[PDB]
Design a protein around this nucleic acid. Structure first.
Ligand code: ZN
Ligand code: ZN
Lengths: 115, 115
DNA sequence: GTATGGCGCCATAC
DNA sequence: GTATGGCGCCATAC
């Protein structure tokens, strides 16, 4: 209940972290990994995963988009448009490209590239 | 293209009339019936129908709600909450209650009842 | 029971 | 081809 506020158009992201924290409060020690990672981009951070839809897309308060794009745009670049502006760092084990069963929504595992 | 502007949070209704006009430009003389009806509540008005979903609900720019509630709230009471505040007039042949195959979204075929 | 909202699937706009 | 968005179906909150 207060985890959402601490992790935090504003009312749409609020609905998005909400969608997220519900998935993370269920995973083991998962909320903890994320709270630390919002603090330091340079400090090492563990992967925080959510399940992957067949589509790839995640729908949040009736808007539908890719998960790492969503949570980056909540926590880093609010002007972020599409996944092309994103690229995964070398740190991350479950990037969106990976097509693996889970997908990392830790916002600092990706850098923004304006092509 | 200009029909939408003439029939006309504002940018969500704009997306809704858009969803609508596309269905009406396909029906025969249907756009015409609606243009007249936005003018006069007291003047007699023909039914303007759209298809009915099994659910009943209509999704518009990612929000989902009942059709007569949507188009009433666009064109009459913007503070309208649920379908309980609505009741169909005696004029209408395809009210939402009717569960018929089409459904009348002419905003003036319904009156608002605060219970 | 009713209300509400996401996902897989599909249809349509570039 | 990629992007985008609605509907039927289902799962969950009252
Ligand atoms: Zn990662
Ligand atoms: Zn009618």
């Amino acid at each position: 209940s207060p985890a959402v506020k601490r992790l935090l158009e504003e009312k749409w992201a609020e609905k998005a972290v909400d969608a997220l924290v519900k998935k993370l409060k269920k995973k083991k020690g998962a909320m903890e990994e994320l709270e630390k990672a919002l603090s330091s981009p340079g400090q090492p951070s563990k992967c925080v995963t959510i399940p992957r839809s067949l589509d790839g897309r995640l729908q949040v308060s009736h808007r539908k988009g890719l998960p790492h794009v969503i949570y980056c745009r909540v926590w880093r670049w609010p002007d972020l448009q599409s996944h092309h502006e994103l690229k995964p760092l070398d740190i991350c084990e479950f990037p969106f490209g990976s097509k693996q069963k889970e997908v990392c929504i830790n916002p600092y595992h990706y850098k923004r590239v304006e092509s």
